[PDB]
């Protein structure tokens, strides 16, 4: 939304991760003075004698940077009456909780959700290397200005890398190999030595998603158990 044709725009909001489970959010009472989004490309162009070679390697980090202030008037809140100074102090404390115990200790959240209701865009962001920058100036005796840069981990609509489920059709665990190893553990020293010798003998004369349906990947695994339990040689083969 904006102020045009549609009803009143919604300010920009920031969602942080609660230590104790759940989530806490932060909405800006005053929209930022500047809002820049850099979306470079990782591509290099090098001309040869009589041709041009273009190579590309994907999308570059989309860097988000914006500058805003806090109003001097108070305004209603979800709990309490917080003025601009308290608002900016809470922002500082939140950033410091996300940054100071990030490399040390542990933070529950792995990332930050950045909501642009005004621009109708969403992304998952992490603190940039430039980081937060607060400054107060002569010609703003009562106000407080903030400058933050961010790097986009990715689109918020997609799911987390660690929370992805593969196809995983059929059995995933080869139980044949598991029981082969379990049975080999009980074998005597001579049995294991003979299995090594047999393996060498077969080896030196060669050249001259587990599912038994619609696949042949788990072939030798079933043979290994059957050869151990039945007994091809003193130990087995393969």
């Amino acid at each position: 939304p904006q102020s045009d044709g549609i009803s009143n725009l919604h300010r920009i909001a920031l969602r942080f991760p609660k230590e104790g489970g759940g989530y806490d959010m932060y909405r800006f009472k005053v929209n930022p003075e500047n809002y820049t989004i850099d979306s470079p490309q990782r591509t290099t162009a090098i001309k040869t004698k009589s041709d041009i070679v273009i190579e590309d390697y994907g999308k570059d980090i989309e860097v988000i940077n914006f500058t805003g202030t806090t109003g001097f008037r108070p305004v209603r809140e979800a709990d309490g009456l917080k003025t601009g100074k308290q608002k900016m102090e809470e922002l500082q404390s939140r950033v410091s909780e996300y940054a100071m115990q990030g490399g040390s200790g542990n933070v529950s959240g792995s990332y930050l959700q950045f909501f642009n209701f005004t621009d109708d865009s969403y992304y998952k962001v992490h603190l940039a290397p430039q980081g937060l920058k607060i400054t107060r100036s002569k010609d703003e005796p009562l106000l407080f200005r903030y400058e933050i840069t961010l790097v986009v981990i990715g689109s918020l609509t997609e799911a987390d890398r660690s929370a992805v489920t593969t196809e995983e059709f059929g059995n995933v665990k080869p139980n044949a190999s598991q029981r082969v190893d379990e049975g080999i553990k009980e074998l005597d020293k001579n049995a294991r030595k003979t299995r090594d010798r047999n393996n060498q003998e077969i080896s030196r004369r060669e050249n001259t998603i587990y599912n038994p349906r619609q696949s042949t990947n788990g072939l030798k695994g079933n043979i290994d158990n059957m050869a151990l339990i039945i007994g091809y040689g003193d130990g087995g083969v393969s």
Binding site: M25, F115, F117, Y122, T157, E158, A159
Partner: protein
């Protein structure tokens, strides 16, 4: 994996391999996948009536592997005979537990809601194909994030997102649903096409791109 296709009026089997895989040379291996006798594509259906299962004619479906599975002999053998059973196997097979479809849509985010059912005779009902994928998305959405006894971080916080129906809560719900739907690797993307409010009732719909 594979792509679907249909026989067009007086299209030659050479023409298909060239258009999809580039080189015409590949048609020779491509006929074994569709298990075709020499008259590989033939215009007339009364000519398909010669020996129906070993031919294709105008209007019939065809199977088109990806190039990596083109040379696999196992893919050849499986695609030869399974034919339409491809999609079902490729989307997989599972027990059907949408017994009370009218009912589970009255108490979601509450437990004890799904149950086995019976179809056919003397056998538990099973679901396959796209229906299976829907059912699985449905169950995944209606389950809380840490409630299955193994492999947790499965499910959603939909039971936690109940709030004052202001738009930020609605974007939050949108994002949770999209995350939940995009968790399965089989699905490519999701995207919202509508969100809509009726006082204390949310309503909206999502389009999901399922791999061919």
């Amino acid at each position: 994996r594979f792509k679907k296709h249909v026989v067009q009026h007086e299209e030659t089997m050479q023409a298909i391999a060239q258009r999809y895989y580039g080189d015409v040379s590949y048609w020779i291996d491509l006929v074994e996948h569709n298990n075709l006798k020499y008259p590989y594509l033939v215009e007339t259906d009364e000519e398909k009536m010669k020996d129906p299962e070993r031919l294709a004619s105008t209007g019939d479906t065809l199977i088109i592997p990806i190039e990596s599975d083109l040379t696999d002999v196992s893919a050849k053998e499986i695609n030869s005979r399974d034919k339409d059973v491809l999609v079902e196997l490729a989307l997989g097979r599972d027990l059907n537990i949408t017994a009370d479809e009218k009912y589970f849509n009255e108490h979601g985010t509450s437990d004890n809601i799904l149950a086995f059912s019976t179809n056919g005779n003397g056998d538990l009902d099973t679901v396959k194909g796209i229906d299976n994928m829907k059912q699985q998305l449905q169950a995944r959405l209606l389950t809380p994030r840490g409630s299955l006894m193994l492999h947790p971080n499965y499910g959603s916080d939909l039971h936690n997102l109940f709030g004052l129906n202001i738009p930020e809560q609605a974007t939050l719900i949108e994002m949770e649903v999209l995350r939940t739907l995009t968790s399965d690797n089989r699905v490519k993307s999701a995207n919202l096409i509508d969100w809509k409010i009726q006082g204390n009732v949310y309503s909206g719909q999502f389009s999901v791109e399922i791999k061919s």
